[PDB]
C-alpha cells in the first residue's frame, strides 16, 4: 500500500544501511583496552557509574578474555574504560557518517547543513544501531566478537539510556523501521546551525509518512496499535537522552580529557 516514491525511499535507506553498518564489527580493530572543583568530581563520579558493563573478547581461536571493572574507590579507576569506549563510539560514528553520505536526500543538502545534521544526530543514530545488537534477555550488547554486559534489575531501568534500550527492543521492530527511525532523527530541522530548515523539515515529514504507511501496510495486529506513535515518542526520548549524555561527556572531558579527534569535531571541541 506504499506509493512508488515511498518504496524507493525505503530501498535507498536499506541500501545505505546494508553498505555502512558492520553488523559483525569485523572491521573494529586497534582499539584501546583497560590496563592490566570537588563538586565537579562528585558529578563526574555520578555520571560514570550510571553505566557499568563488563567486557568480553572472543578470539578467532576460541580463547576468551573477560574484563570486570573496578568498584568506585574515589580515585582515577572510574576512567578505566573511557579510552575503549571512545574508540568504539568513534568506530560507530564513522559508519554513521558513511550512512548519511550514501543517501541522496542528504548528499543534496549544502555541506554546512550536512555537517550540522551529523553533529546533531550522530549519537542518536549510534544508539539506534546499538539497539539492534542489544539482547534484552541477557542485558548484553552483542558486537560480534565483543560483548558488553550490564553488571548486577528494575533498578538499572532507572537509567534513561538503559530504559530506552529495553523499551525500544520490546517493540520488536523490523530492519526497515529502524532505518526510517535513523532517517527521521538525521533529518531534524531544529538542530543547531541548520540553514535549510524548510527543506530538512519537508524531508523529515516524508520519512515519517513513509514509516506510518509502512506500519499500516505490514502490521495489522492489535499488539501494534499505535506503533507509529510509540516510535515517535521513543525518538523524542532519544533526543532528551542525547542532550543529557552530551552534557555528561563535556563534564567528563573538562576534568579528564579522552575524546578522540572525531569526537571533538562532532561535539564542538576545538583543540584550544
Ligand atoms: C554514557 C556516559 C555519557 C556519554 C559518554 C560518551 C558520549 C559520547 C561518546 O562518543 C562516547 C562516550 C563515552 C563515555 C560515555 C559515558 C560513560 C558513562 C556516562 O553515562
Ligand atoms: Cl551507545 C554507547 C556506546 Cl556505542 C558506548 Cl562506546 C558504549 C558501548 C555500549 Cl556499552 C553502549 Cl551501551 C555504550 C554507550 Cl552509551 C557508549 Cl559508552 Cl557511548
Amino acid at each position: 500500500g506504499l506509493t512508488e516514491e515511498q518504496r524507493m525511499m525505503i530501498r535507498e535507506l536499506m541500501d545505505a544501511q546494508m553498505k555502512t553498518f558492520d553488523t559483525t564489527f569485523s572491521h573494529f580493530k586497534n582499539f584501546r583496552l583497560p590496563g592490566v572543583e570537588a563538586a565537579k568530581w562528585s558529578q563526574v563520579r555520578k555520571d560514570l557509574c550510571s553505566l557499568k558493563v563488563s567486557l568480553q573478547l572472543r578470539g578467532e581461536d576460541g580463547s576468551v578474555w573477560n574484563y570486570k571493572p573496578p568498584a568506585d574507590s574515589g580515585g582515577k579507576e572510574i576512567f578505566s574504560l573511557l579510552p575503549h569506549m571512545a574508540d568504539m563510539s568513534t568506530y560507530m560514528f564513522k559508519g554513521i557518517i558513511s550512512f548519511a553520505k550514501v543517501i541522496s536526500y542528504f548528499r543534496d543538502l549544502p555541506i554546512e547543513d550536512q555537517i550540522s545534521l551529523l553533529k546533531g544526530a550522530a549519537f542518536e543514530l549510534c544508539q539506534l544501531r546499538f539497539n539492534t545488537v542489544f539482547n534484552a534477555e541477557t542485558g548484553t550488547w552483542e558486537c560480534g566478537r565483543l560483548s558488553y554486559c550490564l553488571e548486577d534489575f528494575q533498578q538499572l531501568l532507572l537509567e534513561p539510556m538503559l530504559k530506552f534500550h529495553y523499551m525500544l527492543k520490546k517493540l520488536q521492530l523490523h530492519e526497515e523501521e529502524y532505518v526510517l527511525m535513523q532517517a527521521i532523527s538525521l533529518f531534524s530541522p531544529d538542530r543547531p546551525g541548520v540553514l535549510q530548515h524548510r527543506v530538512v523539515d519537508q524531508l523529515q515529514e516524508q520519512f515519517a509518512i513513509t514509516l506510518k504507511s509502512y506500519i499500516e501496510c505490514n502490521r495489522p495486529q492489535p499488539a501494534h496499535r499505535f506503533l507509529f506513535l510509540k516510535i515517535m515518542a521513543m525518538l523524542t526520548e532519544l533526543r532528551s537522552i542525547n542532550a543529557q549524555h552530551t552534557q555528561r561527556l563535556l563534564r567528563i572531558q573538562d576534568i579528564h580529557p579522552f575524546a578522540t579527534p572525531l569526537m571533538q569535531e562532532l561535539f564542538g571541541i576545538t583543540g584550544s
Side-chain angles (χ1 to χ4, degrees), residues 1-4 6-7 9-10 12-28 30-35 38-45 47-51 53-59 61-67 69-72 74-75 77-100 102-144 146-151 155 157-162 164-169 171-197 199-272:
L2 296 171
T3 72
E4 257 300 319
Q6 292 177 331
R7 295 203 311 280
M9 182 178 283
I10 291 174
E12 218 213 335
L13 294 179
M14 287 296 292
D15 187 61
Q17 187 88 309
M18 173 274 287
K19 291 163 169 175
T20 68
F21 190 179
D22 179 16
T23 60
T24 65
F25 294 75
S26 293
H27 301 296
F28 177 47
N30 309 321
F31 46 75
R32 296 165 287 178
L33 286 169
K40 288 190 180 180
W41 276 84
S42 50
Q43 186 55 231
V44 159
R45 270 184 252 287
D47 294 332
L48 286 165
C49 66
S50 54
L51 170 79
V53 287
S54 61
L55 196 167
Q56 178 165 120
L57 287 118
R58 293 171 295 290
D61 56 18
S63 58
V64 184
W65 278 103
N66 196 271
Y67 175 80
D72 189 349
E77 68 279 350
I78 62 177
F79 305 133
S80 68
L81 270 173
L82 280 181
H84 176 77
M85 274 166 17
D87 290 339
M88 170 59 91
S89 73
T90 297
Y91 182 69
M92 294 299 288
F93 288 151
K94 288 168 179 174
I96 294 308
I97 294 164
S98 303
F99 171 79
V102 168
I103 300 169
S104 68
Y105 317 88
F106 188 87
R107 271 196 327 258
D108 294 343
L109 296 163
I111 193 177
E112 297 79 14
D113 277 2
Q114 294 188 37
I115 295 163
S116 298
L117 291 182
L118 280 165
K119 294 182 177 181
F123 177 86
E124 300 178 16
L125 272 70
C126 182
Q127 296 298 335
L128 290 171
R129 282 183 166 187
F130 257 80
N131 189 255
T132 72
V133 304
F134 184 61
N135 184 333
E137 286 73 50
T138 70
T140 301
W141 290 273
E142 301 177 337
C143 303
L146 310 81
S147 299
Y148 307 92
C149 181
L150 295 161
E151 286 289 71
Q155 198 178 337
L157 254 64
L158 297 187
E159 183 56 32
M161 196 238 305
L162 303 184
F164 173 87
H165 277 281
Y166 277 98
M167 289 179 61
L168 187 58
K169 194 74 186 195
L171 297 179
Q172 299 188 259
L173 297 186
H174 303 170
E175 300 280 8
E176 291 78 356
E177 292 159 336
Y178 275 105
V179 76
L180 280 158
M181 289 183 70
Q182 290 173 201
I184 294 162
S185 164
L186 182 59
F187 292 95
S188 290
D190 51 327
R191 304 289 186 188
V194 169
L195 308 171
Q196 302 280 63
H197 168 269
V199 173
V200 177
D201 179 81
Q202 292 178 78
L203 288 166
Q204 190 189 54
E205 173 173 26
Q206 291 313 308
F207 291 123
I209 287 164
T210 292
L211 176 62
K212 179 172 194 282
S213 295
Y214 177 93
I215 288 164
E216 272 156 24
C217 295
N218 304 300
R219 292 176 174 278
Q221 298 85 0
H224 308 307
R225 284 173 73 190
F226 317 118
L227 184 49
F228 172 71
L229 290 182
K230 290 183 197 185
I231 293 167
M232 292 311 290
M234 291 304 282
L235 284 178
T236 294
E237 176 65 1
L238 185 54
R239 187 93 170 261
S240 163
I241 293 164
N242 185 17
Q244 295 176 331
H245 271 52
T246 293
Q247 294 312 314
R248 297 183 182 184
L249 177 145
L250 293 181
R251 287 194 296 270
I252 297 163
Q253 177 76 8
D254 175 35
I255 72 172
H256 183 78
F258 75 100
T260 62
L262 180 50
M263 286 168 62
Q264 293 168 52
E265 274 292 310
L266 291 164
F267 284 98
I269 312 171
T270 66
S272 292

